Structure 1
């Protein structure tokens, strides 16, 4: 379930069900009926690998960290000669050693994965 359907009335979420006679899947709440068409083919999505370009929260204050190393990599868009780079934040050995560069002038995140 990429998204969770919440009942308009009350605040509980919606169980999945099939109309059988109408041959259309519908989402229904338990406190109240709230019957709708539920036009969404997504019923369940399972993930097995880390998302590409996970990066981090990249708050606007990322440039105020004195411990972040600085480099001279060229910015693809604003062509600045300054940025801060850090490795992937995934906490296992499956992740690679790629570096994510963040420009402090235009707040653009570009990686060094030339490949």
Structure 2
């Protein structure tokens, strides 16, 4: 996806490989001009998943899933059974630890497993 124009006729260069040369070269089909390639990179693309242009708003693609909610646990500060549970790592601990977030709009309490 790297396009460059040769200095002679200002036309697009096509990458090619020569077994004898054992080096990357660029030569356009308009003039018999060959230049030494740089950085040895013929394709560089940042991976993106935005293949559905102008369609992700009307149709719910669910790119960011909602966290699950459970009613078995009971909050400490308030007697509310609804909470949000998820797995995340601690500041320096190793592994995944279950976390809880209270769903009461007036409580705002979070605790670990």
* Length-normalised TM-score, structure 2: 0.39
Larger fraction in strand? 2
* Length-normalised TM-score, structure 1: 0.39
Q: Give the greater-gyration-radius structure (CA).
A: 2
Larger fraction in helix? 1
